[PDB]
């Protein structure tokens, strides 16, 4: 899965990159300040495989808010809504790789 993820993450990065200039303006400057709520946090899951402790990671997905008041300006609100869920899936997929490394 290492290389599979190394490539799908680049695919998602490309998917958003082609989106970032559809509105023809910077989005990062507003993004890095707007984000003030967290949803894709993690929880310590326990599973004694063979009588041995293993604190695994559960993808604590909270799909109710990710960043407030960053869409509807009139040129790019819809476009960012497109590739965002790609990252929402990619991060959940990436949680499991670390869960396995631990």
């Amino acid at each position: 899965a290492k290389q599979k993820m190394g490539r799908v993450m680049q695919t998602a990065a490309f998917s958003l990159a082609e989106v970032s200039y559809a509105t023809g303006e910077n989005i990062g400057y507003q993004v890095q300040e707007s984000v003030s709520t967290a949803r894709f946090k993690v929880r310590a899951r326990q599973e004694n495989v063979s009588g041995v402790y293993l604190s695994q990671f559960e993808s604590y997905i909270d799909p109710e808010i990710n960043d407030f008041r960053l869409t509807g300006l009139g040129r790019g609100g819809q476009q960012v809504q497109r590739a965002k869920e790609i990252y929402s899936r990619a991060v959940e997929t990436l949680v499991e790789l670390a869960s396995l490394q631990t």
């Binding site: 190394g6 890095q32 984000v35 967290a38 949803r39 946090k41 929880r43 990671f57």
Partner: protein
């Protein structure tokens, strides 16, 4: 520990913006510290990377998983290899503007022996 909740990101803006868009991060006004140290190409040195790595790992108990670009880790590759603990779950994330190689991983180095 149950404090292993927050996620650390040391990556270029093209990835950090999207990561925060997915809702992984936030602003921590209690220290005015972001969940990440933004990276600027050709403007950020290597000592900053080491300092933020140490701050996220051995100074912050919040971080559970760390995402770092391959090129950024290259600046602290020796530091990353030297440090090997299960708590931070260090992960060399693929980097935008660079086709990531899934073989530069410090973690995968131990996988490369005793198949």
């Amino acid at each position: 520990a149950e404090k292993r909740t927050l996620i650390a990101v040391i990556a270029d803006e093209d990835t950090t913006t999207g990561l925060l868009l997915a809702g992984i991060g936030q602003i921590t006004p209690e220290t005015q510290e972001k969940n990440f140290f933004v990276y600027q190409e050709g403007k950020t040195t290597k000592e900053e990377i080491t300092d933020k790595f140490n701050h996220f790992t051995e100074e912050r108990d919040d971080i559970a998983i760390l995402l770092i670009n391959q090129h950024i880790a290259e600046n602290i590759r020796a530091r990353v290899d030297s440090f090997t603990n299960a708590f931070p779950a260090i992960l060399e994330i693929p980097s935008k503007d660079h086709p990531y190689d899934p073989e530069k991983d410090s973690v995968l180095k131990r996988v490369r022996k005793l198949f």
